[PDB]
Every structure is written in C-alpha cells, then in structure tokens.
Amino acid sequence: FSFIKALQTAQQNFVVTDPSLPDNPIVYASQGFLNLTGYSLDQILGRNCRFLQGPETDPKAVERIRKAIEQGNDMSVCLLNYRVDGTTFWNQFFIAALRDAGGNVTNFVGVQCKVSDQYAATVTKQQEEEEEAA
Numbered sequence: 001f002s003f004i005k006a007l008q009t010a011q012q013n014f015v016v017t018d019p020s021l022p023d024n025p026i027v028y029a030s031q032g033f034l035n036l037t038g039y040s041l042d043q044i045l046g047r048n049c050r051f052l053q054g055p056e057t058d059p060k061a062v063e064r065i066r067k068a069i070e071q072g073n074d075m076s077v078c079l080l081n082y083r084v085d086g087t088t089f090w091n092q093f094f095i096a097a098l099r100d101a102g103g104n105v106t107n108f109v110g111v112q113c114k115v116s117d118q119y120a121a122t123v124t125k126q127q128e129e130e131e132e133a134a
C-alpha cells in the first residue's frame with residue numbers, strides 16, 4: 001500500500017495489475033515504465049504485460065513468472081524484454097502479490113529494472129544452472 005508510494009518516490013519503473021479482471025490487466029503504470037518501454041498509457045492500460053516479451057525471451061523465465069502469479073507469491077528473474085520499437089533490454093524483474101487484510105490477493109506489482117550486459121550474463125547463467133539442476 002505504502003509499498004506502492006515507496007516506488008513512486010524511488011521513481012521506479014512499475015505497473016500494478018488487477019487479477020480480478022480477465023487476463024490480469026494493468027490498471028496503473030508509472031512514468032518510469034513509460035519511459036523505459038516507450039509505450040503510452042492508452043497502449044497498455046487494461047492489457048496484460050506479456051507484450052514486453054519477444055521471440056528471444058527465455059520461456060523458462062516467463063514460466064517462473066506465471067507460477068508465482070498462479071500461487072500469489074513473490075519472485076524475481078532476469079529476462080529479455082522488448083520496447084515498443086522492438087529494441088531490447090535486460091530486465092531484472094520483480095513481482096509481488098498484494099493481499100488484503102483477509103489474506104486475499106487483490107493485485108500484482110511488477111518492478112522493472114534495466115540491467116547491464118555484464119550483470120545479465122551472470123544472473124541468466126545462474127538461472128540456467130538452477131534450471132539445469134531441477
């Protein structure tokens with residue numbers, strides 16, 4: 001709740017989605033998200049965030065995000081995302097399930113952090129090794 005306030009003042013790139021609506025659409029996007037991705041609000045409001053994914057996005061990573069959403073818990077992962085002009089960037093992605101006072105999930109918050117090639121090489125390597133383990 002103030003978590004979201006904290007992201008605003010930290011000027012982060014994030015969206016909030018509403019899983020009560022079909023296909024878990026975006027109901028808010030920060031200015032930082034618009035700047036990073038090059039989309040406008042009209043393009044993304046009421047839409048699922050998968051438009052950030054492209055042909056070279058690791059599907060194992062997308063799957064990890066899917067399970068956390070199905071279970072209503074938190075995770076992070078580094079994957080390839082795509083801007084509106086089709087240019088790419090490395091995204092250290094974080095997602096949190098927001099629960100109400102009764103413990104029911106009301107929202108998801110996805111924070112996008114653009115990261116370097118150097119950083120991404122290490123983390124995706126570690127992710128590949130984790131996947132190879134299981």
Ligand SMILES: Cc1cc2nc3c(=O)[nH]c(=O)nc-3n(C[C@H](O)[C@H](O)[C@H](O)COP(=O)(O)O)c2cc1C
Pocket residue numbers: 015016017024048049050052053062063065066069079081091093095108109110111112
């Ligand atoms: C709050 C939120 C933020 C999201 N942000 C991203 C993102 O930055 N990058 C990404 O590749 N997927 C993002 N997604 C994941 C997709 O929306 C989708 O949940 C994922 O691709 C798995 O579900 P699907 O198989 O139905 O596409 C986000 C999802 C949520 C709920």
